[PDB]
């Protein structure tokens, strides 16, 4: 059960990371932070649940995938706003390690791990975006 | 022969891909069998050079999951527990499909014996999730309705 | 992976079922192949669930016994040694039978690890036995003569 | 269980050359396929007596040897790396190749549990061998261009 | 070995306790009790042989199946002639399991299972068919 | 599973072999073998139930301490009435220590043990009593 | 200990079923099934000693040999008296295998074994007798 | 020795986040955040100590439950000062459980592990009450 | 060697036998000793051969008795703790008896490491008995009384 | 069976004391086989009793004992290595002498897996030791040279 | 006791052989019978010693040779399976035999557990096998036929 | 890597043996022998390498067919010449199980053992064939 | 059944390299290697037999005795041919402890053991025979 | 003792077959060969003895060096006489890795081995110099 734990509870600490930084950005990628804090529930609902549970859709990466394509067009901390998506990034990193260690031991969250990576990708773009929306000013 | 049994799915499943697809009637089925035949091959390499190679990638995975929501969206709700069958398109895709899942199977049993890329496992599940989607599609533009058990 | 092996032999076996049906020309074979590709999800859960779901029962195997011997009747004497072939109905169908017969050898090994009804063994066996007498019947009705070996 | 796998993909095998062969179109196809067919039956002997009966012979090895030059010749040179497919004709056999060097697996495993005559593997590996030079041919005759990796 | 002697040996003590029984019983009723101590034979030369010989068929098992059929439309021993076929219902379903016991451990005797299997739930029905006939009169 | 197996089967038996043995006795001693019929039932429910199902009662086995006294007051088989009961006792025997075999595996089924092994004794003493009163005339 | 218990259990049950077979047969078939009665009484007796007591003798043997040379000279249960010794035989069979398992694992009871089994080959032919007795009418 | 350094670590990491997350509420918060630095202080020198160091008092977790009882009558990070003390019941969570793996490894630290988990579920209360009183405005 | 050991005193009790033959002067005896080193030979192929060839039977291990039977009635009331000994004749039996209990012991040990038949151990330890017969009378039919212990 | 091989060594060489005691032709010599055929149902006893039953004494061994000495007297040097022979006489007691050095390994492997009196073995030794004075007295009285190796 | 049981077995064979000597008529046999008597010390000394000492030559297991093809030229045809007897001088040799054939099995033991010379058991085999021969003759210069099984 | 040193020095044994035995032989024979050590070498090149390096052909073993074929229409060492031949008759035996010994334990030198086997039974009938050759002479 | 194997092919090496050996030769030596290249049959066909086969006589081993005390009264390779035999004798000592190791093994192969052993160096002999012929010259 | 045994056997095969070899070179080669057969005796002396006897001297294999490096400046068998030399290497390379596998076996036979390796080096340079010499005719 010590995999789910870490899993879960290492999600928990990455929402509240979001949570936090949701504050120094601009609507529109607060709302798209928000937006993750949904899926990441929906990935902490079926982890806990061990499968039972429904995760996150197909559909929800396809969105993430849409959404690196559309920022890769245009030291971590710039700025503090940078250092709190980078934050976030490594964090990210970490609970998509210990999502593949449950995965690996069961062989459940599949998409998650998935969508965590690209996740992490993301979270690397929005900080280095404004870094340059900042920079450009 | 720990990864060997692995690659004689590779081989076994590759061939069945390319049964199913000489029997499709659809280009876009025909062109997605094609491009995993090739992606097979590369997994294939990925596992008998424990990485040292070529290695399967993440647009390679993020291709397969463009394609099953797009297919997603033209079938719309899929009840569970399909019987199998319905047209030679769509029965020869779930022997495929079978094969595919018989696949990850081998590919679990590798990973705890020697080291595997996830990639490897992560493709190896979205094909038999969108080999699935084929098979529906198959008997939709047939106008062929599935049985629910 | 105990069982797990053991459903991934029925989805693979079930998918074949519905190709030799797609393919058969008969109806009382595809109903058959119908029933059990239904009887196939049962015995899937069966073993999933250590027999606390849905359960093989003896008419479901009194059933396959029903049809065998329905069968043996019109075909006559078996000799022994067939070589599996003929046309591609038949031949379709001694590729399920053997499916059907390593499905068996995956039932036995699960057993000497997990509990396992023996109604799912017993199923297991008259379904591979039963697949034999349909390829031979296609054979029959299609006038085309088996090859001993 | 030890040659009891064993039998069970020769018995696998065995229906898949037969469905392969009712769908060829050339009658040195089909006449190999048909030698095979038996010499599979005595393969399986070999095996299940511990070679106390009929035995794999060279002749046996010898004739498909001599049958995979003939053909390595109407082909010229083989690039690696063949995307199994082409036709249904070169699809079905690189179905039962695949089963081939599936069953070549199966006999690696029971030699080193139980005794096995050599010349079992070596006909193993030489069928694998040819069933490729079949799907290729397949293709040739019908002008078919093989897909290379 | 074992689990081979202890099934045929078991199998020869249910064959005799209908021998006993077949004397109880109308003619209808012995011609059949008749049927199965040689189809038993047949299934104890199976076993005996370790499979070389050939067992029982399945026309054996679909003429069962026609009897339970046959006699499903109309505390053990109502009568004595009752309790005779009920005590042979209880040796039935022992040889059943001790036959069960030869399969999962060598993979011999399918249709001998199901043949004692169906068997024993006719035994049940032939020992209530007299309590009925007894009782209607 | 198989002592639980072994337990009821042989229990089977037993009630069977009574039920047969019940026709040769006056109503009175028919009444009890009847009686105990109902009691081993309530054992193969406790058992085959690994002790869900409530067994019999400690009223159940001071009835037949009853019946030890009241009869102990007053070669198997003087007669073939005698040889049934005696027969039965043989069984009784058996599935005491079937029984036996259940508990020290589990810890199930106390004063089933308990009212089997008064039961053997009381078989025997009825055998021993048709024996004295058929003597007696 | 447990060969030793299945041995004599399974003894006491064998003496019962003569004890209800002799009650049809001649005078003289019965003299002959009491006195086995006995035999298979000083069986037990050296069984349950573990062979501090003396069991059957040579002579006992000898005797059963006698008798099988005597009768030779003239599907189980021909008659319900035919079918009671052929059940007799089944059962000293096991007996016979029950008491050979104890034999192998301490080195006591050959002459029991012998015994046990020249009986149970007795057991066959006085079946057939009565049949041949009955049929010869 | 790792579950204590984990323990102890993992609890440097926990009164570091308040430390900076008190900088963020109003006095009464703060004074209440500050008197928490202490008992984990008291805590951490229990557990670093192994046992020896006296821990906590019970009148120290009555406290706490004062407070949960005070709060509770009126997605993390409603604002960024909810998203501080949400961060730091995450933290609480995980702190409690590497001590709870103190606790059945050794069996020390058994107030610890209730008064981190009467904390966490304060946490969410503080972080929940901001969220009400700027939305209440 | 596991029968091994068996065997070679199956060859030393029989060349022990055919010396206390040589000695007996009572031809009811000398007869026995014979059909006994027979009998051996008889035993040695059951063993040696698993059962397959000639076996013992049950009237071979009859005849041992009804002898035995038939001598315990000329000598009478058998006290126990015999010295051995008392002419030559009884000596040279006492030996041949040793050797016979050495030669249960023997088979005891086998049977416990290969399968032997019941018959064999049977058959051996009723000759032991009968060994000490023939020491007793041929002291009765020389008036030698025994020492007890 | 522990002690059972020491017991039936015990009865082996027992016999064969009584059968060099019927050959020789002098009186402290048959007395002296004699004690011991005795002596060997008490040592008998002790080892299958544990010791709880009679047990071998001092004396049983000091009378050994005081006989070898007596007869070491008669013979004078004992030069080493005689090969065992000379006369009937003679060579019967060589024949027991070995068997009871074999007694002797037979309580030595016995002590090592369940207990044994020291006395046993004490005895067990004296008495191979006295056996050799015997075969040598006897070629004495006789007047036969031993030879030496 | 590794090799504490072989020489105990050489010392037990070989007072076997001095009985049988004193029992012979014949100078020839008698003679071989010392020499073996002899070559049983050095046997002994070779085992004992590790063969540090005094060795088992080839001459020595020569000589023997040399002697049973001189004999079987005498008997002629050996029919198989020879029950042992025939006379007290042929008797005496086939226990002497027998002794030898159980040493041959202790060395055998022994070999497996410690270090021996080759020649120790090929002499030991061939002293078996001559002393067979001896007993043969014995009963031909008696005019005594051997009885075959 | 022992079974390959093995399988290849012993294979250099059989080449320099063949070199030796091609100076006895017409220019035929010689020409044939001279095209084997060509293959043997081959042979041991797909050994050393492990498979990497590609051994021996098809059409290779086709040849020897064709050889053998041509041959078989027309105590060791008749001639010298022929005791040569049977020489290395002897040792193509040797490698032909040294290299089996190869693939049982890796895979590898399929063809390889197959050419070899052939060619045993070549130099068996070219032994003979001068043995012929001389003596029709 | 690798010692066999080795013992065998071994034996083919020895009687191959006599077969070249006995062109060297006079009449006389060549019809003794021609009679050992007999006796080497029934050895290897004693040996590949695993002992149902008979092999050599003890006639054979005197034969050779006989031979060894003829020769013995009258650096390899003095001469060519002294050399063959000489090479001979090496084979003969290896194929001597390749046979050697199959008795250990079985307990198969005793003659032959001895007859080998006698064999080399009676090779031996020989070889110093033509040695001392040339050199008397 | 095993890797002795064959060491030293392999070694008497070598030494065995450059006595026949010796017999078609110069006077001049012919001395050299008689002189390694000599050093090998002395090899196979301190291997028999197992280090107790001295071996070859140092001398020994700076005088191989000097050859090689005299010869080196001038298929296996382009004649007999080549071929036989060529068989020799071969015999070298096996005698030098079954002494090498007596070294890493006990730690004896250091030089021996250098000696063997040099030894096939030169075997070869003598075969191909004949090759020239008589290709330069």
């Given at each position: 059960d010590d995999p789910i734990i870490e899993a879960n509870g290492t999600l928990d600490e990455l929402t509240s990371?979001?949570?936090?930084?949701?504050?120094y950005v601009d609507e529109e990628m607060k709302g798209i932070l928000e937006?993750?804090?949904?899926?990441?529930?929906?990935?902490?609902?079926?982890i806990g649940s061990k499968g039972k549970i429904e995760g996150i859709?197909?559909?929800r990466i396809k969105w993430l995938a849409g959404l690196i394509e559309r920022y890769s067009e245009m030291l971590p901390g710039?700025?503090?706003?940078?250092?709190?998506?980078?934050?976030?990034?490594?964090?990210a990193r970490r609970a998509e390690r210990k999502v593949a260690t449950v995965l690996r031991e069961f062989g459940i969250g599949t998409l998650a791990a998935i969508y965590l990576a690209l996740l992490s990708r993301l979270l690397f773009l929005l900080a280095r975006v404004i870094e340059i929306e900042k920079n450009k000013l | 022969s720990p990864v060997v049994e692995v690659q004689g799915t590779i081989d076994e499943l590759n061939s069945f891909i390319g049964y199913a697809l000489v029997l499709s009637r659809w280009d876009d089925?025909?062109?997605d069998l094609f491009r995993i035949q090739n992606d097979l091959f590369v997994l294939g390499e990925d596992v008998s050079t424990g990485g040292k190679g070529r290695t399967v990638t993440m647009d390679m995975i993020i291709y397969l999951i463009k394609r099953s929501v797009e297919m997603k969206a033209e079938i719309g709700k899929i009840e569970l527990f399909v019987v199998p069958g319905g047209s030679v398109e769509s029965a020869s895709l779930h022997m495929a499909r079978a094969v595919s899942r018989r696949l990850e199977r081998?590919?679990?049993?590798?990973?705890?014996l020697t080291e595997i890329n996830a990639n490897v496992l992560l493709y190896a599940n979205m094909l038999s999730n969108i080999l699935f989607m084929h098979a529906l599609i198959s008997n939709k533009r047939l106008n062929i309705p599935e049985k629910i058990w």
């Amino acid at each position: 059960d010590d995999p789910i734990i870490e899993a879960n509870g290492t999600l928990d600490e990455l929402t509240s990371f979001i949570g936090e930084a949701k504050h120094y950005v601009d609507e529109e990628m607060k709302g798209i932070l928000e937006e993750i804090q949904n899926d990441i529930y929906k990935i902490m609902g079926e982890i806990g649940s061990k499968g039972k549970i429904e995760g996150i859709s197909e559909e929800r990466i396809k969105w993430l995938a849409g959404l690196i394509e559309r920022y890769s067009e245009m030291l971590p901390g710039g700025t503090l706003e940078s250092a709190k998506l980078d934050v976030c990034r490594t964090i990210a990193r970490r609970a998509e390690r210990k999502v593949a260690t449950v995965l690996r031991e069961f062989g459940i969250g599949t998409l998650a791990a998935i969508y965590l990576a690209l996740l992490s990708r993301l979270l690397f773009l929005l900080a280095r975006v404004i870094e340059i929306e900042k920079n450009k000013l | 022969s720990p990864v060997v049994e692995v690659q004689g799915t590779i081989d076994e499943l590759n061939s069945f891909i390319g049964y199913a697809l000489v029997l499709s009637r659809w280009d876009d089925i025909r062109n997605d069998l094609f491009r995993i035949q090739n992606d097979l091959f590369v997994l294939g390499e990925d596992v008998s050079t424990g990485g040292k190679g070529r290695t399967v990638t993440m647009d390679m995975i993020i291709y397969l999951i463009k394609r099953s929501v797009e297919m997603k969206a033209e079938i719309g709700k899929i009840e569970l527990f399909v019987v199998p069958g319905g047209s030679v398109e769509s029965a020869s895709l779930h022997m495929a499909r079978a094969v595919s899942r018989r696949l990850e199977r081998r590919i679990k049993a590798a990973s705890e014996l020697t080291e595997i890329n996830a990639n490897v496992l992560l493709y190896a599940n979205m094909l038999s999730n969108i080999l699935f989607m084929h098979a529906l599609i198959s008997n939709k533009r047939l106008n062929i309705p599935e049985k629910i058990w």
